[PDB]
Design a protein around this ligand. Structure first.
Ligand code: 2PG
Ligand code: MN
Length: 509
């Protein structure tokens, strides 16, 4: 039948020499290793300019998957917006101005909300300072900030530094008041866990949740309970009279300064959807909100986009489609969006011939509680499909390393890696039996450093290079490649012509 070519992405699996806090190196990976010893391999740059990001910036699932599926260096939003601020164009943004014009003409309020850190994955605090300075320039009187605490793209208990810096800028620009503070767990969920979402929503609209006069005391009090940045309960900052600093009301304007869509869609829909059934918003639910998305989130969001998106044509998925091949995209909840939407270049609709399998991730708050996650069910489901001789190409993502690594815990991250390695063996073998080829790789680093030099949790990504194995004897892979070379390599294996849009180059010599 078919000799399937499979693209296998071991999420957050990177190569790093130091083995201290390196889950990847400490894990027993017989399968992975044997493939690395017995087949052609290399490494690829998945950070900075190589993937369309500023120099020094680390990579992540969105970037990685856009680039991997695009076959070219994809220009990222972070970079694009940093440049706008640099070139004096940010202040001339018609969407920002219209938002500020709105609150001024109708005398409502402007609210700014998003991740409060310099992680650069979902946002950057510097953009917020940019919106605050622009606001002061435009003469907006009432500006309120609703902060989503990080602890995931940055240190786990670094919120206080960001809060302190923000307070300095506030005083410097002369506008803005921190209204609420919520952990990204509740305000930026992407797993459709509406109870978490509702918590954040009700804090911002009804001033419901833990109340404090001082933002810093809110943080310190939560730490005392062992609850850090990422998981802090949506809290409300109150005034001297006990009233909330500010609640979101009819006709106010909202600028969500996040530039990555997966964790922004949910809370955005909660604010803009005329009909919302996931949960009851209650009778005061603010209506007529002038809503601004920093970048395109989804068509379901009844708002405006500051920076317009641009189609990426002829991504691996499209080429496969145009040539009549049947493709499958598969992963569990946590990375389902990446193997589908991002892999297809920011498109949600399946291509003709494209099949998708979604496997539910375990019902646990944090994955360090269940390292193997749902890796076995994914593998099972995939093996059946492989056995049926249905697909010409396959795109699989094992989310374990990144998900468990984000916990900053060494032992669980090792179990995760080993769980993935076991499954990987079963998958690559079955592929080989069908006479196909596999392309083992990753989208970015993480699991390779889940502890700081000092032995403390390291919850973020790394800048280390990712691995690449092509299960085909008799060939050689060139070095110095980048993720944008993977798509071309797959088309090479499939004997399909490479489109002009893909400015990348096959790794096969
Ligand atoms: O959890 C997420 O949304 C990011 C970190 O902010 O991780 P990844 O890029 O791997 O999805
Ligand atoms: Mn991650």
């Amino acid at each position: 039948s078919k000799k399937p070519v499979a693209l296998i992405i071991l999420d957050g699996f990177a190569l790093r020499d130091e083995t201290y806090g390196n889950a990847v190196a400490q894990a027993n990976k017989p399968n992975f290793d044997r493939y690395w010893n017995e087949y052609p391999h290399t490494t690829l740059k998945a950070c900075g300019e190589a993937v369309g990001l500023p120099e020094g910036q680390m990579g992540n699932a969105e970037v990685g998957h856009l680039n991997i599926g695009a076959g070219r260096i994809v220009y990222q939003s972070l970079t694009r917006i940093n440049i706008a601020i640099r070139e004096g164009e940010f202040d001339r943004n018609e969407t920002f101005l219209a938002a500020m014009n709105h609150v001024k003409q109708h005398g409502t309020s402007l609210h700014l909300f998003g991740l409060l850190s310099d992680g650069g994955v979902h946002s950057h605090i510097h953009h917020l300072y940019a919106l605050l300075r622009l606001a002061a320039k435009e003469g907006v009187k009432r500006v309120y900030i609703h902060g989503f605490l990080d602890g995931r793209d940055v240190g786990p208990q670094t919120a206080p530094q960001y809060i302190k810096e923000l307070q300095e800028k506030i005083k410097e620009y002369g506008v803005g008041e921190i209204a609420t503070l919520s952990g990204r767990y509740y305000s930026m969920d992407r797993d459709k866990r509406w109870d978490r979402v509702e918590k954040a929503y009700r804090a911002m609209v009804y001033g419901e949740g833990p109340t404090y006069r001082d933002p810093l005391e809110c943080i310190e009090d939560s730490y005392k309970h062992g609850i850090y940045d990422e998981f802090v309960l949506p809290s409300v900052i109150v005034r001297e009279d006990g009233r909330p600093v500010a609640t979101i009301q009819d006709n106010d304007a909202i600028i969500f300064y996040n530039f990555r869509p997966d964790r922004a869609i949910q809370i955005s829909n909660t604010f803009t959807n005329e009909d919302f059934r996931e949960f009851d918003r209650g009778p005061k639910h603010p209506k007529h909100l002038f809503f601004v998305c920093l970048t395109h989130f989804s068509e379901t969001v009844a708002g405006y986009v500051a920076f317009k998106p641009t189609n990426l044509d002829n991504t691996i998925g499209e080429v496969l489609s145009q040539h009549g091949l049947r493709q499958l995209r598969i992963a569990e909840t946590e990375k389902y969006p990446h193997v589908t939407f991002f892999m297809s270049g920011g498109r949600e609709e399946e291509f003709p011939g494209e099949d998708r399998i979604l496997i539910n991730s375990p019902k646990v708050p944090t994955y360090d509680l269940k390292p193997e996650m749902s890796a076995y069910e994914v593998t099972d489901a995939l093996l059946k499909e492989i056995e049926a001789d249905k697909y010409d190409a396959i795109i699989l993502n094992y989310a374990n390393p990144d998900m468990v690594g984000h916990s900053g815990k060494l032992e669980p991250t090792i179990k995760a890696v080993e769980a993935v390695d076991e499954c990987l063996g079963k998958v690559v073998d079955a592929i080989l039996a069908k006479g196909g080829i596999a392309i083992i790789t990753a989208d970015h680093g993480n699991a390779d450093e889940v502890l700081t030099p000092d032995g403390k949790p390291q919850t973020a990504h790394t800048t280390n290079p990712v691995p690449v194995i092509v299960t085909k004897k008799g060939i050689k892979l060139r070095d110095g490649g980048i993720l944008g070379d993977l798509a071309p390599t797959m088309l090479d294996l499939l004997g399909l012509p490479q489109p002009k849009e893909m400015t990348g180059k096959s790794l096969i010599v």
